[PDB]
Design a protein around this ligand. Structure first.
Ligand SMILES: CCCCCCCCCCCCCCCCCC(=O)OCC(COC(=O)CCCCCCCCCCCCCCCCC)OC(=O)CCCCCCCCCCCCCCCCC
Ligand code: HEA
Ligand code: HEA
Ligand SMILES: CCCCCCCCCCCCCCCCCC(=O)OC[C@H](COP(=O)(O)OCCN)OC(=O)CCCCCCCCCCCCCCCCC
Ligand SMILES: CCCCCCCCCCCCCCCCCC(=O)OC[C@H](COP(=O)(O)OCCN)OC(=O)CCCCCCCCCCCCCCCCC
Ligand SMILES: CCCCCCCCCCCCCCCCCC(=O)OC[C@H](COP(=O)(O)OCCN)OC(=O)CCCCCCCCCCCCCCCCC
Ligand SMILES: CCCCCCCCCCCCCCCCCC(=O)OC[C@H](COP(=O)(O)OCCN)OC(=O)CCCCCCCCCCCCCCCCC
Ligand SMILES: CCCCCCCCCCCCCCCCCC(=O)OC[C@H](COP(=O)(O)OCCN)OC(=O)CCCCCCCCCCCCCCCCC
Ligand SMILES: CCCCCCCCCCCCCCCCCC(=O)OC[C@H](COP(=O)(O)OCCN)OC(=O)CCCCCCCCCCCCCCCCC
Ligand code: CUA
Ligand SMILES: [Cu+2]
Ligand SMILES: [Mg+2]
Ligand code: NA
Ligand SMILES: [Zn+2]
Lengths: 514, 44, 49, 71, 227, 139, 62, 260, 104, 47
């Protein structure tokens, strides 16, 4: 029974719950990895001896948070929990390959942990840039195990993306148009299109250096005509698309929570919503080399790419301005999710403006691979994606379980998260402006100050994680059921009761004839 | 989102026990490890 | 009066305030850690070789 | 007896006057940043480059003899 | 080469770094402009108490909402285009130097005449002579004359690095089989510091860079007297 | 079991008039109140006004807009837990952190400060701009 | 998609079901971005909460 | 009859989990053989994933063409998913093509500045690669004839169309193996040799996948599985085989017509 | 859209003879959906509907939600008193100020 | 239908005994937190 329903799953609700379980697992694995990183960065000198293991733990940090944490919550878990219950679908189109992607992801987790177990270790960062990960500097099974873990994550993500696109363009009742679905539907559609057209690029690159390692070829060895510039192009033509996969369900989640708790019956400018989302989904590919400005590109293509990033800044600015406009003019219930959303608005704004500051080309000549970039992606991930998924979790938890959290505990959690991330990563702004390069274990006297301050903020975030799992236990122990849910007339996921039953949408909905 | 009274209501005691429970339990790993890092360092 | 936030809110305000200022002053000053606060105005450098 | 007060577009007039306030405070803090740091850098570099002599400056850094090229 | 409680950037050594921080100050003016805008509008709409939950009309603001970002993004971008287009003037390369990034250290060669190469390493903390700098001091500094454009040919031999001198204000990726050009100019004699800025192994933190600016006269004095 | 399908009660500024009343079960005195409601209007007094208001609507705007104390409650417990994190810092400095590097004491920072003013590191605004080289003192 | 677009009082929109409860989604404006979701039960004809078109249930057992 | 929607109902299955575990065993065998020269785990990986993919598709054929849950909307979604997989493989191959184009448009300094690098003798594209194009294009036009004979309803002609397209595909595979035995150098020999050997062998992996799909669709058609219009198995076969036709054409024109 | 037939159609909609609790709830919720303080004749038609449909509590709710829609400024309300005073004592309906529902 | 559904019981972990459930969360998330601790101690032994 347990093996047939859970281990042999075929329903999106249970698959999303097990997504949430594995995502919490990988999330605090990453938290502990970041704490080893930051406690090593808390004291001047080397806490962990050699910095090879420091490179291993920053590699594991990047991998398990980017590929193993927020994609499994937002894309997998929240997508599978919401999307059928949001378009009216009973199930999704291809649930067995959905479940196969699910059951293949923890094998990639196991390969990453085994790569950590290997004597050599994955001392390369998020990037697997050759010839650091080549046959001379990383002769071992750790980097190869990371490459196959990326293979498994990529395969699971491609087949999941096929699942999302088929379950959107298929499972909808026929008379509703595409341009009137909820915003999270558009977010999962555009992200999954970006997945489908981006992950083959990563798979090609990692197979490319896989054949460089084990098949004794020379695709990245310039003594035999190789080119590491080719790997950087392939990897980051994956990377910035994968960035926009990594971020757009946050757009969808906060848009839904804002139009829920702000008293609105609709988001402002839903045509503007969908137009901006497909604009960034379309031209998210042709901006791929803004991470690239100091490898030796031509000046003309540098100007082209920085202009393209200024262009992609334009409709995201339209998105944030219209977020302000859709939270305009309504009663604001002071839910904790609104606290998360407002923190997301501020911190996404400042992170995006910092990203533009990076996007200017000569300042990127000076400030490449520096903690200013760290402050970029922590202001837009460590509180952008993190506050987005906290808002999603504390908003849809009665649908996920049947019980509610404690509002005071959740607001205290928001306060702890907020103060920890700001007085962590504003000293990282100062560190990047002062200019120490990344992936360093020890730092001089000028950097010691902000290193200590931001390390203390990292331990504040540890306290935040502990309070989060405490209130999860508190909710599951108090088990307060929900008598009524507001805005169920406009929210489809909330009208099947908390929680929705096993077999939802047996009869498909009666769409208006028009 | 309105909710009915708690099916089971934790007592100051229960809340205390639990909050501390994880706090300590979740951090204890760090405790044993971070505590003897230098020993661990010993190749011995 | 019947809610928890009437008197216990001010109580936890005072208790948390005292607790945080005491612990954070102790951490900032009473350990012996080095903030590496800026040497401008406060140090007297001496000639080296 | 009281005359007719505003019935329509209260939030509307409030929002236009306060978005105008948003522009004026945004330009105000931009001018604050300028008057604080921006032209001090230009004027400091400028006075440094008139009152600067590289030969003399090297001379007092090399009386200390703290150079690999100076002995 | 940084000072404690640093909130801004390094002071310039190069004129390009000078107008680059002028442009950077312009971008900072922009970021607090937008941040104060969004903060005050958020504060306004959290301090309000009026409700308007009707059907909002849409096709009235998108033209301003797309032309104000259009103008602000292009007037940020045209200084960026100008600075990027003047990174690469016709050079007057009075001096040439090649840097060859080795596994866990650097190599510097002057190869215009009387072929000279040397290897630069990390001074250990116990071997640090008193008064010097941890994680920045190098037993063999690299000398360059002031007030001249000198060409920098950067490459690496086994692992990619990044020769980074934020005091001079540049950072060039050292790639195996590929050398890039960086034109260095300085205004002040003296020491200037940098580091690697790519991941390169189990001593990645321990390849720093030191450039001391001397005249051409003391440059040729060192070149003659080192033999 | 079916209240998610049935119309339900709510109290917010967004929804002034709920579709259903707060109290559905109706006692005999409340049927008397309803037939008095269907009776004449001007003969209906203050107290039956207030219980009819309370049995048809749960709470009013005066008891829905009140500025409650959870903001100070949550900020108090939050910065209490920040103090707990400070104690975590106390323990973590006490146990895993060993000695600082010897390039950090007062002696070494004295020599290195003298050296970095000697080489005049970033003397425009960074460090050496706040130093007088004629009087040998801070600005 | 269904037929008989007629949401008057004398005739409502007929909806077939095999159960006692049934969902409807009103696109009650032309080219409307909003969709209005609500449940109905067997009995009196259900109505739309922002436009007022009427929906009725009929059981069909297939 | 409880299911009122015309979509698909799935009885929970172990086979996604076992396929996932078989992929994990496959990659563990790959690292075990690439580092510790052991073949047992790799053979286990091949046996596991091939068997598991066999009964997974055996289950979907059972539940589709005998039970009958494959609604016209369901194969509408199936053709969506097949198109999605096809275009994902387009961009996979196109990443490989653009890697080749980056390698070849700018020849690096160690190659003599000329494409191909000097001292190697790549095979002439004049005769046997034209044979490859001829045999693959003939197979593609034969399977278009097979689709139109599905439309017409002529069973023996469908039989000969399938027999000739499998005969052509297997002839393709065995001959490209023969000039793998008849090529001047190996995949470990240079940037140019490495890229076209990897690309052509990777296309060879896709064409043996396509040929096996043609084998299985033939054995379905012998068992009277496909019908007049619900013939999505052969639609997927036709789309994949036209895909490998056009991908072969692209790598042909690039590798052979470009720099030889 | 304009004011004259706007509040005219509001008055007629609230003063229809086939009035019901459903559409009074509809009209008042869509009224507070707008960024509008409803005018005395709209409130007059609303209390006409509440009079003919017998809901003292709904009338008190209309008064309380215009208490809410008065905004930060408290001169709107008393103006509502001075132009609706004949209707209140005409019907016997009274205000939350007199009946004590302004306090917590 | 044939599978029991409701609040809490649609989770992979049993809910009814909250002390034992707390034990499950402590061991689960504690092992998750202590995993990279076990990696780093494993190379510090191994190096
Ligand atoms: C069913 C009836 C009872 C069957 C036996 C239950 C005990 C053994 C078991 O098979 O236990 C089941 C297993 C399930 O674990 C997995 O499946 C592994 C996934 C990786 O439990 C674990 O291993 C540990 C789980 C610990 C508690 C996790 C709480 C998560 C809270 C945060 C997310 C909320 C999401 C709400 C939505
Ligand atoms: C959520 C993830 C996320 C998001 C959204 C972004 C968004 C952006 N990123 Fe970045 N980025 C990363 C994650 C992300 N990034 C990561 C993880 C790395 C490095 C990885 C590694 O180093 O290994 C990285 C690296 C990175 C670099 C490399 C720097 C270097 O290392 O040398 C650059 C430079 O161009 C860059 C730019 C941008 C830009 C220009 C945007 C924009 O999309 C931001 C747009 C958002 C806005 C909100 C626009 C602001 C507009 C307004 C506020 C409206 C009003 C203002 C005006 C009208 C002016 N990113
Ligand atoms: C998703 C991406 C992500 C996230 C959240 C974080 C979060 C954090 N990061 Fe991370 N970081 C990266 C991605 C991320 N980082 C990348 C890509 C690099 C560069 C690697 C490279 O150089 O190649 C990097 C580098 C990096 C460094 C540089 C190390 C070095 O190069 O020397 C440092 C050090 O301060 C750091 C610190 C932190 C801290 C203190 C947090 C904190 O915010 C941690 C707290 C956040 C959480 C705890 C998440 C919340 C989730 C849960 C609590 C569980 C979820 C469960 C449910 C929702 C049910 N990061
Ligand atoms: C390599 C992994 C291949 C996995 C695969 O092809 O699975 C077949 C998949 C499952 O069948 P599915 O349609 O999801 O079943 C539910 C309704 N019949 O079949 C499908 O989902 C239809 C075809 C998908 C092809 C995916 C290829 C990868
Ligand atoms: C000391 C730690 C245990 C405190 C136990 C306690 O006093 O619990 C009472 C209260 C429970 O929460 P309560 O205020 O009833 O509900 C909030 C409604 N959103 O607890 C709280 O409100 C939280 C008190 C946290 C004190 C630190
Ligand atoms: C005058 C020309 C000029 O350079 O003005 C600078 C600024 C307006 O700059 P502008 O380009 O119009 O837009 C902001 C950034 N794009 O104009 C200003 O910053 C205005 C400075 C004068 C008014 C200051 C008011 C301060 C109030 C406190
Ligand atoms: C949030 C704000 C927007 C993001 C800012 C990111 C960059 C940053 O933190 O810049 C710090 C800025 C520049 O530093 P600056 O004051 O020039 O220091 C040199 C002389 N003190 O310094 C300042 O702006 C002053 C200090 C921070 C104020 C906020
Ligand atoms: C350092 C940052 C610390 C942030 C701490 C935020 C705590 C927020 C607590 C909260 O929301 O309390 C609710 C309370 C308003 O309660 P309510 O009765 O709904 O409103 C009547 C008038 N506002 O009070 C408030 O809503 C006021 C506080 C709002 C904070 C918003 C922060 C956005 C970022
Ligand atoms: C790499 C691995 C993945 C390669 C790509 C796989 C693509 C699979 C697409 C499946 C599409 C699908 O589900 O089609 C629906 C069909 C059932 O419906 P249908 O049969 O059309 O209608 C009833 C007819 N009256 O269902 C099917 O047709 C399911 C069966 C499709 C695949 C048949 C087997 C092909 C095997 C190819 C790989 C062989 C591997 C072993 C040999 C090489 C080893 C290196
Ligand atoms: Cu060289 Cu890091
Ligand atoms: Cu990017
Ligand atoms: Mg790099
Ligand atoms: Na350190
Ligand atoms: Zn309608």
């Amino acid at each position: 029974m347990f093996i047939n329903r859970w281990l042999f799953s075929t329903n999106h609700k249970d698959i999303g719950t097990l997504y949430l379980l594995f995502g919490a697992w990988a999330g605090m694995v990453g938290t502990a990895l970041s704490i080893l990183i930051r406690a090593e960065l808390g004291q001047p000198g080397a806490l962990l001896g050699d910095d090879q293991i420091y490179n291993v733990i920053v590699t594991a940090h990047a991998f398990v948070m980017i590929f193993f944490m927020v994609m499994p919550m937002m894309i997998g878990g929240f997508g599978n929990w919401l999307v059928p219950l949001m378009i009216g679908a009973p199930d999704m189109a291809f649930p067995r390959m959905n479940n196969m992607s699910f059951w293949l992801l923890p094998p990639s987790f196991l390969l990453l942990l085994a790569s950590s177990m290997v004597e050599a270790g994955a001392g390369t960062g998020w990037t697997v840039y050759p010839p650091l990960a080549g046959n001379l500097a990383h002769a071992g099974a750790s980097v190869d195990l990371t490459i196959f873990s990326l293979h498994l994550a990529g395969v699971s993500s491609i087949l999941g993306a096929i699942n999302f696109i088929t379950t959107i363009i298929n499972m909808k009742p026929p008379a509703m148009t595409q341009y009137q679905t909820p915003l999270f539907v558009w977010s999962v559609l555009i992200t999954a299109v970006l997945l489908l057209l981006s992950l083959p690029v990563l798979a090609a690159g990692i197979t490319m250096l896989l054949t460089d390692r084990n098949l004794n070829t020379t695709f990245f060895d310039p003594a035999g005509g190789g080119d590491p510039i080719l790997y950087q192009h392939l990897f980051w033509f994956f990377g910035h698309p994968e960035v926009y996969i990594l971020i757009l369900p946050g757009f969808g989640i906060i848009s839904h929570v804002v139009t829920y708790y702000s008293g609105k019956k609709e988001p402002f400018g839903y045509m503007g919503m969908v137009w901006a989302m497909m604009s960034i989904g379309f031209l998210g590919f042709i901006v791929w080399a803004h991470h690239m400005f100091t490898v030796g590109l031509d000046v003309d293509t540098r100007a082209y790419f920085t202009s393209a990033t200024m262009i992609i800044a334009i409709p995201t600015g339209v998105k944030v301005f219209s977020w302000l406009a859709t939270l305009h003019g309504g009663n604001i219930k002071w839910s904790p999710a609104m606290l998360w959303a407002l923190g997301f608005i501020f911190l996404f704004t400042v992170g995006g403006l910092t990203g533009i500051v990076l996007s200017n080309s000569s300042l990127d000549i000076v400030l490449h691979d520096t903690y200013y970039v760290v402050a970029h992606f922590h202001y837009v991930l460590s509180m952008g994606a993190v506050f987005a998924i906290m808002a999603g979790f504390v908003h849809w938890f009665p649908l996920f379980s049947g019980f509610t959290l404690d509002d005071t505990w959740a607001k205290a959690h928001f306060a702890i998260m907020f103060v920890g991330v700001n007085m962590t990563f504003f000293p990282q702004h100062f560190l990047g402006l002062s200019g120490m390069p990344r992936r360093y274990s020890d730092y001089p006297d000028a950097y010691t100050t902000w290193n200590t301050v931001s390390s203390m903020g990292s331990f504040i975030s540890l306290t935040a994680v502990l309070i989060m799992i405490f209130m999860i236990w508190e909710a599951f122990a108090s088990k307060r059921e929900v008598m009524s849910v507001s805005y169920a007339s406009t929210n489809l996921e909330w009208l099947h009761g908390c929680p929705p039953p096993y077999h939802t949408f047996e009869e498909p909905t009666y769409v208006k004839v028009k | 989102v309105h909710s009915k009274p708690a099916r089971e209501q934790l007592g100051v005691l229960d809340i205390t026990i639990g909050l501390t429970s994880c706090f300590v339990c979740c951090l204890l790993p760090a405790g044993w490890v971070l505590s003897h890092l230098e020993s661990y360092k010993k190749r011995e | 009066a019947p809610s928890f936030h009437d008197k216990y809110g001010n109580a936890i305000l005072a208790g948390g305030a005292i607790f945080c200022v005491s612990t954070w002053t102790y951490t900032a000053t009473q350990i012996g850690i080095e903030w590496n606060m800026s040497p401008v105005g406060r140090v007297t450098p001496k000639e080296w070789r | 007896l009281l005359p007719k007060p505003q019935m329509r577009g209260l939030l509307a007039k409030r929002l236009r006057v306060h978005i105008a306030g948003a522009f004026i405070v945004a330009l105000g803090v931009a001018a604050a940043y300028k008057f604080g740091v921006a032209e001090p850098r230009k004027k400091a570099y400028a006075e440094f480059y008139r009152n600067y002599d590289s030969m003399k400056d090297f001379e007092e850094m090399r009386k200390a003899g703290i150079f690999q090229s100076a002995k | 080469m940084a000072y404690p409680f640093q909130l801004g950037l390094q002071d310039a050594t190069s004129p390009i770094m000078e107008e680059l921080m002028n442009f950077h100050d312009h971008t900072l003016m922009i970021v607090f402009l937008i941040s104060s805008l969004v903060l005050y509008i958020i504060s306004l709409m959290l301090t309000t108490k009026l409700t308007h939950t009707s059907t909002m009309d849409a096709q009235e603001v998108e033209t301003i909402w797309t032309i104000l970002p259009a103008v602000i993004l292009i007037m940020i971008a045209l200084p960026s285009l100008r600075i990027l287009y003047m990174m690469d003037e016709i050079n007057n390369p009075v001096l040439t130097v090649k840097t060859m990034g080795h596994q866990w250290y650097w190599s510097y060669e002057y190869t215009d005449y009387e072929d000279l190469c040397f290897d630069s390493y990390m001074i250990p903390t116990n071997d640090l002579k008193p008064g010097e700098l941890r994680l920045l001091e190098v037993d063999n500094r690299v000398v360059l004359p002031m007030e001249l454009p000198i060409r920098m040919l950067i490459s690496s031999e086994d692992v990619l690095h990044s020769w980074a001198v934020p005091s001079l204000g540049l950072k060039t990726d050292a790639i195996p089989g590929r050398l890039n050009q960086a034109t260095v100019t300085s205004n002040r004699p003296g020491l200037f510091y940098g580091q690697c800025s790519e991941i390169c192994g189990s001593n990645h933190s321990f390849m720093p860079i030191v450039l001391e600016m001397v005249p051409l006269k003391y440059f040729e004095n060192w070149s003659a007297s080192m033999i | 079991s079916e209240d998610y399908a049935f119309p339900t009660y709510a109290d917010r500024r967004d929804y002034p008039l709920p579709d259903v009343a707060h109290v559905t079960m109706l006692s005999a005195s409340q049927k008397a109140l309803k037939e008095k409601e269907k009776a004449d209007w001007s003969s209906l007094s203050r107290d039956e006004k207030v219980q009819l208001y309370r049995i048809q609507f749960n709470e009013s705007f005066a008891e829905m807009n009140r500025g409650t104390n959870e903001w100070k409650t949550v900020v108090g417990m939050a910065m209490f837990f920040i103090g707990f994190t400070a104690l975590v810092l106390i323990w973590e400095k006490s146990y895993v952190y060993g000695p600082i590097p010897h390039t950090f004491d007062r002696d070494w920072v004295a020599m290195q400060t003298k050296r970095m003013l000697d080489m005049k590191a970033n003397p425009i605004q960074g460090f050496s701009a706040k130093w007088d080289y004629d009087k040998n003192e801070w600005k | 998609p269904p037929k008989a677009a007629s949401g008057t009082k004398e005739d409502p929109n007929l909806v077939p079901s095999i159960s006692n409860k049934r969902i409807v989604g009103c696109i009650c404006e032309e080219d409307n971005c909003t969709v209005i979701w609500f449940w109905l039960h067997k009995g009196e004809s259900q109505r739309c909460p922002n436009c007022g078109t009427h929906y009725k249930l009929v059981p069909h057992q297939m | 009859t409880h299911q009122t929607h015309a979509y698909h109902m799935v009885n929970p299955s172990p086979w996604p989990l076992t396929g996932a575990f078989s992929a994990l065993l496959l990659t563990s065998g790959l690292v075990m053989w690439f580092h510790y020269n052991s073949i047992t785990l790799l053979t286990l990986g091949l046996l596991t994933n091939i068997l598991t993919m066999y009964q997974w598709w055996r289950d979907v054929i059972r539940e589709g063409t005998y039970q009958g849950h494959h609604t016209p909307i369901v194969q509408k979604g199936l053709r969506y998913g097949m198109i999605l997989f096809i275009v994902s493989e387009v961009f996979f191959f196109a990443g490989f093509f653009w890697a080749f184009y980056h390698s070849s448009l700018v020849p690096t300094h160690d190659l003599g500045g000329c494409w191909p690098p000097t001292g190697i003798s790549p095979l002439n594209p004049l005769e046997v690669p034209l044979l490859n194009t001829s045999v693959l294009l003939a197979s593609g036009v034969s399977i278009t004839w097979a689709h139109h004979s599905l439309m017409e309803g002529k069973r023996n002609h469908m039989n000969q169309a399938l027999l000739i397209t499998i005969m052509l595909g297997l002839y393709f595979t065995i001959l490209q193996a023969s000039e793998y035995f008849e090529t001047s150098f190996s995949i470990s020999d240079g940037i140019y040799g490495s890229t076209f050997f990897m690309a052509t062998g990777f296309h060879g992996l896709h064409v043996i996948i396509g040929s096996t799909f043609l084998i299985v669709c033939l054995l379905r058609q012998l068992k009277f599985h496909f019908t007049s219009k619900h013939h999505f198995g052969f639609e997927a076969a036709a789309w994949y085989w036209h895909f490998v036709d056009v991908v072969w054409l692209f790598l042909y024109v690039s590798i052979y017509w470009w720099g030889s | 859209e304009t004011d004259e037939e706007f509040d005219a159609r509001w008055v007629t909609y609230f003063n229809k003879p086939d009035i019901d609790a459903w559409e009074l709830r509809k009209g008042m919720n869509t009224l507070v959906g707008y960024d509008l303080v409803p005018e005395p004749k709209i409130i007059d038609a609303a209390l006409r509907a509440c009079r003919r449909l017998n809901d003292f509590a709904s009338a008190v709710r209309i008064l309380e939600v215009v208490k809410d829609k008065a905004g930060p400024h408290k001169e709107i309300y008393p103006y509502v008193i001075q132009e609706l005073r004949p209707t209140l004592n005409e019907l016997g309906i009274s205000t939350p100020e007199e009946l004590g529902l302004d306090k917590v | 239908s044939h599978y029991e559904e409701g609040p809490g019981k649609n989770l992979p972990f049993s809910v009814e005994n909250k002390w034992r459930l707390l034990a499950m969360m402590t061991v689960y998330f504690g092992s998750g937190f202590a995993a990279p601790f076990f990696i780093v101690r494993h190379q510090l032994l191994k190096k």
